[model samples]
Target: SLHPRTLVAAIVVGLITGVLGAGFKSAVNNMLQWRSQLAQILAPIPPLAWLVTALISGGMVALSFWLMKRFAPDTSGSGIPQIEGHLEGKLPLVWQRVLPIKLVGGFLSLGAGMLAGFEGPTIQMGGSIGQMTGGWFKATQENQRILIAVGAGAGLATAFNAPLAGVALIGEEMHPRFRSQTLAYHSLLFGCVMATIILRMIRGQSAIISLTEFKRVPLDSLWMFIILGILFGVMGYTFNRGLFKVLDWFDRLPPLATKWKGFLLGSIIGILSLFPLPLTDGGDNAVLWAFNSQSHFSTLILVFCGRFLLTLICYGSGAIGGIFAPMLGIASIVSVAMARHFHLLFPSQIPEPAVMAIAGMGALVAATVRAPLTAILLTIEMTDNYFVILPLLVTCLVASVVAEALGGKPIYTVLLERTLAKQNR
Candidate 1:
């Protein structure tokens, strides 16, 4: 029952978002590669390498920060909350301003070795594209809402190359509450499909993260995943708290310090990138490293702890990136380490320790985002480990429950509330 114009607009939004998202990914990767090549060229001179890397990253981040402050402040952080706020009729989005700012700002932040993800920018940019498309088509208010939601889903789809997860994200996480549910839902599917098709065409069809396709976990091992879920629940709660605390600290900085914050943080991160671990970037490398690593428990924990802290710092500093990818990195570290211990204790029961890593990836997202369906689909799709569905379901549900019982709210909801409060003042 959707109008033709609306559907056409949806496809346009999806196509453009797909192209932009793919371009963003490629640009960020190229920047990282260029920086790594520079470091290699200067590797012989350790001091000079460190100094040059730091200065380059610092300059990039400082300029990114300046752009955000000067042109579009709403592009800060994940931009998900901004989209959500606009959906709820509490904020306005100027696509012309936000689209370019988020794309360039996100590139600078993530390329500078900041521990941030691309999903946030894509999602926000997708919504902006939706708004622009709606304006062009002269969509009705109701249809505009539907298009915006569709665009947002397409953005997510393009981000992880997971079409179903993107649809689930809009339905479960954003909860747009459209008037015409059927039309809105169908449009969301159309947009995601179109976006994903374009994305795969440009990026090639493959799992975003190449991990082992884990078999179905045994029923008896379900209890082990429950424990994993609980661990992530607690950690998710702590992560949300720690992130807010860091934001508070950043907010309390003097004006001068705030102005130079990006330079200082980016320099530290750039210097950290000289190390071998996955401490910098958006966390895909970290996840791969954890899976293939043969490191001891202590080293795994150290990396997890390091990423945990760095994720908070980078995001809290108001850099233009998403937290989702970084969280995956942190979750993989914990799950891999815990699985090793479990294997040591009950080797026969837990046949494959790495299986738990996939479940943990979803569990942390479920706990923090409180969208188990999206988390489950995202995990399965990103890794192409669909056989682990039962374990994923159990782990995600338990993690969500534990986090809820501990009075932990969804991170985005709290973020939206915070944004509203600040604006009201």
Candidate 2:
């Protein structure tokens, strides 16, 4: 049904995604800096800093809850699911309200220290904008849908500057009309490039982390990745359980009692930003801290626990964010932690935890998203670590299969369903 018209609209959508994605990235970054300025007031001594941090976290989470209730409940958490649903016609695209609310609400929740990613909101909004543009251009519904998918792809491409991953994910996860003989494949490819270029130009060409450059896993080491994948398969399962359970818990909570939770929680994060500036913002800064060498393994473990739990709390409270950024940190932390243990045991294979660092990034995403290729490419592009390709592919594939065997559907698919059911109800 889609024709040449879809191509034009999709291109416009891609351009918009690049612009919006860059802006969103910058705004959240600024918030992280603000948190840095407030860190000294947090005082990490003994029970004090942790206590204040928790309270502030609790309150910011509360604010997130209040915002969800106040504006668009559809804007809750990662918005990827909605775009998936919309493409599948299981959901409707509401660009008018979604675009603005997702931006503002997501900023507040993420800025408050929620362990979420920014990609979901950006993708969903991007898709909506695509559809809106299509309609304005007087395209047919089929063309509109095609452009919408392109926009979604663009959002992902721009979000990480991983255009290839973005396009691959659309095929792997958001494939629409499995029966359709032809779709807008050409349009999507073009749009993905535009989006990534726009975002890269504005945000600068840098992977999320500037740490060590990774080498690819040797061909003989492929078997080792299989082992790591299975390990993450279990952790990935736990992530879903924890994610939904926490979401449900917050849903059942009384709004009045939790109304002030957001402001107070944000204040606490603001306070923590001063001291050990690393832990104050999203888990990125704290990632390198795990491998600082000066940090004892015990210290790394403790920080991991705090970050993991806090991330759950921040997201479970219906924060407007995604796990793309936070999950990388989690996977990196736990993966390195395991690598340390593996070295104690195998000693021969692992020269360092960095290998695990690369593999774990894709493993976690593969397990959760169930799209190994997307996870693999995304990690490589986001980290600019090409050498780890074989290992990443091996681990990501195993992770996907194991997660599927364990009855874990892709996070976006399930998340989108929840939103549609809520709106219908």
Candidate 3:
């Protein structure tokens, strides 16, 4: 149990994490917005427009690849393993290098034409901040670890504005090591609430997705998510396996990795970026486009399939990024696109397309991370529609359970392990 350091200590932790999390997010967004606005401004130019965009993106991505390969290979991909290492007492927390590397590297990589997410870096950075601050507080090693965990939770909460998901992750994904977890939960809750409050204050309280509430999955429609779950569970398996292939494919590249390869990948992808493909670095652009565009069902399928394959390319190249947000993007496209078909087939049975969106979000996250509750809460926070909680829960339950029974491992865990093993070698 957490000592009553105060009825207020918990509150204080919350306030700090919340504010810091929000601040971090704003900083990242400001940087990204500036770059994106520039690209948009140049869109009207002829071939020069596309060349300028690709050239800029190519330079950034290439620089990112070179920096990581040359200096901190461990910095590639997500920061989860670094946190996992510190928790396992298998590695030291190098806040000095990590802080700047992740912040700047994540900024450039995401801002470039890479498909990735900021949440992973935010979470990792939050933990680093926590560990650093905990040292100043002179807490015991155990308490220090707890503080780092709290910061990690708060990082995720503040980013997605989901306090419950942060808390649930402590119980589900972090499991035994967030041990003494009852203490960890309270501590994490403290950070998450504070971070969310701070983030909301600064960013405004609007949910990330601006969609109207999707109709709740009527009781009869519950069966649909089960089928949805099974489908996604297979998709999740494919996602995991495909991810491995992507990694391997990238690894087979010539020894001149990151040199010309970064430039080539960037130049080619960068030029391709100019075309009206439903993609952008973080993949959020595609999400908005997919949802708002008057796209046909067949076309949406084509976009979904294309992005899904290309995600492997984007992420597989180890371009200093992550798939946390991209996964959400992928799920949104899949669900929204499929909802149209489902409704056409059963027109009378299911009417709300948004419900399918919500279900897909949970099902995919559950299938990949195998953390159903965290997925549910995240979808709730991101979408801001609590009415569908029942169906969301149903979908996540069947999805994660089936994935688990199929012997699937959580993606982050595997990613972290792979990263650590490489670091050790």
Candidate 4:
């Protein structure tokens, strides 16, 4: 369905994004493993070990912030809003600057135990790759836009190995300005497929997380999902509000010693990283831990609250990463807690608390992004549990509706508004 040049560009974009995503993924994984290995080596000397972690982690994050501030300010934070602005034709895309900065800077921030997602860097870099390819081919403005969208889709596909969600993302979240089949739709598919193939070739095809398969719940228990949806809806709203407040609070800091400001924050996170709480870094480990264990209710609540506040703090510091993954961590904590509560009251009806946790996984995402379909597909693909679709749909849809009814704006929209405001200033 794609034109010859469009199709070629899409494939190229996918290839570039695939390699980038896989390499980035591997780098972060290695860094995490190495950090833990070093921790083990130093475990006998508690104070020295703590001090080493603080310095190394703090220094890595500080360097990441410095790179962003110096080379590409737009690469700061999630970079999603900047990509959206480009799609909307309100911002410029300098692939030369963004790609390298986002890649290296994102690696540093996420590697240093910041609570950020690979999607942020990969998605933004993917869009940049599309632009870069389009320029090489001397494509028309319309074609370039389409290519950018495809690249972004490919980026998401490569990041999570979820090709369908990557395709859905362009249509649902990015809201590309392209007309129908003439440009937008087919290119997204082409890009996503190609990138996913390349990624699997390099990294092997496997779901990001290995979750337990849950049996279908009785029809009588569907009401609990609705209740879960309501809870997530409220939490999503509060999260968005709290995030904005944190951003503002950070913005109010004195402009002098901005670099040290970043270093100081990173230092704090580094110190926290030494603690044995689920409060630092991305949420993937936390999610896995939650699903596998049956911690006391009080413990679950503590980790959830700690992660909730940490997500705000880490993201608020203008780290170059995404919040989507951390939101899953939050969802898992609270949702599993809710499941435990339901199990206590109606043991017969709720035989599998994990199912409820899985359903709630997409609720906050749907509520935050205001894109229930993308959240649904993403959750299904990440966990490889297609059987939970019915409940996932119910939970995600209700969360979206509740958030919308309460007049909560989509998170990306708010970020874009803030970006444009700062640019004009």
Candidate 5:
């Protein structure tokens, strides 16, 4: 059992995280919309429009990168590793530095068409909020840990409007070992519930990504999902390897080039934004586009390949964002394409092509994160396709097993280790 004051503080953490997380989403969307409007206004003058669009996004990302490097470098990438390190007592969490830096940096990075996700910023910021609230409540260090975990869950909840997934993330992904299991879990629930309430109040009570409610997959078709899982498992391994390789390349850049890297990359992304396909922006629009698209197999594969490389480049460049959305987009493209092909071969077993998209969504996440529970809950909650759970489980489970069998460690674990190595150096 925990103190009542601690529970109250958990609620406070959830409320604050929810508000800020929702605001982060809104601000990023507004920034993106504003740029699109600017592009449309300048559409008449092709050269000028391209130049202006490039400059705006380039400047946004450049400034964002500069701020991150100058003030809080830990705000780079997903920030999940930072929180995990803090929870493990290996790193310090400076809320004052991380909070503002991550918020503004994430907004500019994602808003300026980076291939990232909101969950990273929200989760990191949520952890910072947890630390801040714990201080205000004069919590013990142990209690503070619990609050941080709770706040992080709240942040995730607000990001996807999925309370259960948020809670599951804390347990299955973060895996923060605490002294009081009951207290920690209950607080987690409280924080997620409150954060979700606030998010729904602002963002409305709906799944984040609007997709068809897929019907229950036939048990006979389970083997197909297993194959899909294996495919993602291999892809996930390749994705992680490529990501690390990109990060290494970026790390070897000259000092001056490093400083201006964001501008250069952002300029390219800005220019790419003028074209169709999943080249820029956080993964939401890309996922939606992929889902509803009727492009040929070659086109879909090209899009998937393009997104795969871009996701690596964007995140590997140490941009302030999450990989979740990008992975989802990539997964959707691959699954949808594969599902269509499978339908052609065995139309009877695969009744619905889109259903495989849902399973693939979780499969890739499971493969990369090695947290099948979190991935499953997140997929179900995000799509509201609970009927696909049996297949979802098979896919995720096999995906996890295959990824591990390939000796591909969990992405975040490696990320945290790298962070620690850099800090020690």
Candidate 6:
């Protein structure tokens, strides 16, 4: 059992994370909507409108990166690795610098239509909240770690409105070692549950994406999910390998001013944002598009490839955002394509292609994260597609197995390895 004060602090962490996470998502959505509306207003102006939008987008990203480089270099990238490093005592968590910089930087990065997720900001800020609260409570460092884990879990819960997945994420992915270190598991649950309840109360109980309610597939079709898992396994491996390659290339570049690099890179994404919405951003819009809309096979493939390459670009640019949403986007587009192919091949057995698409959504995530439980739960929770759980489990499990068997490492682990290497130097 936790100390009464610990439980109380956990609740507070949940409340703070809920407010920040929900508010951040709402703000980003509103800004993106406003940006789109503004673009329509400038539509009649032709080329000038494009330049205007590009400049604004670039400026947002430029300022965001500038803040990271100038005030808090730790705010760069997803911030998950930083938090994990802090938990392991391999890195410092300067909440004073990280909190404000991550919040503002995330707003700019995500707001500028970069391919990034709000999880990065929420996770880091949530951990900052924990550390800040710990200071106020005058807790020991051990207690602070518990609080940090609680806040981090609350962040995910608040972001996706999935408290259980949030709890599981901390145990399974973020702080696996911490689970055995203290009686913090209950506090984690308390914080995540509280945060999720608060977020849903304010943001409503609707799932984030509102995907189609897919019916369960026939048991005989189990093998199909296995095959789909294998395919996603390969794709996930490729994505991880490609990400590091791009990151290395960026790393090797002559040390340019972070501002100029951000502007140049953000300018490219800004220009690409003028294309169909699928080509830019953290992929929520793209996921929705891929899920509920119709598109040619070729178009789906093109969008997937474009977004796939763009994911590497935006993330490798050292922008402050999470890859979770973009990975979901990549999985969704490619899943749809795979579903279509299967439908064409096995028209009689594949009554609903969307089922396969939904299952595949979790497969790639499981492969990359090597946390099948979180991936499965997240997909089901976000989409409210409980009927597909059986297929989802099979796909996600097989995907994880295949990816690991192929020597594919978890993405955050790889990122943390790089972070530690830099810190040592």
RMSD of model 2, in Å? 3.5
TM for candidate 2 is: 0.87
Candidate with top lDDT is: 5
Residue 424 displacement in candidate 3 (angstroms): 3.7
Q: What is the C-alpha RMSD of each candidate to the true structure, in Å?
A: 1.4, 3.5, 2.6, 1.6, 1.3, 1.7
Clash count per candidate: 0, 17, 4, 0, 0, 1
Q: Write the per-residue lDDT of candidate 6 for residues 1-425, one digit (tens) a residue.
A: 45778888888888888888988988988777677777779888786768877888889999997788778888878867888888887888988998888998899989988998988799899999989888888887788898888888888887777887878788888754644446788889888888888888788688877555568478787788888999888888888899899888888767665438888787777778777658898787888878778977788888888989988988987889788888888898888888888989886777899888888886777898888998898888887878788889988889888888899899999999997888733
Better of 1 and 2 by lDDT: 1
Q: Estimate, for each residue in 147-186, the C-alpha lDDT of model 3 and write its tens digit.
A: 7777777777877778888777766776646445456667
In model 6, the clashing pairs are 115-281
| lDDT to native, each model | 0.86, 0.72, 0.72, 0.84, 0.87, 0.83
Error of 2 at 26 (Å): 1.0
**Which is the winner by TM-score between candidate 5 and candidate 6?**
5
Choose 2 or 4, whichever is better by lDDT. 4
TM-score, candidate number 1: 0.97
Supply candidate 4's per-residue lDDT for 260: 79
lDDT of 1: 0.86
lDDT tens digits, residues 19-54, model 5? 999989989999988988898899986678899999
For model 5 the local lDDT of residue 378 reads 86
Off by over 4 Å in 2: 1-3, 40-67, 178-181, 210-213, 264-280, 286-294
Off by over 4 Å in 5: 210-212
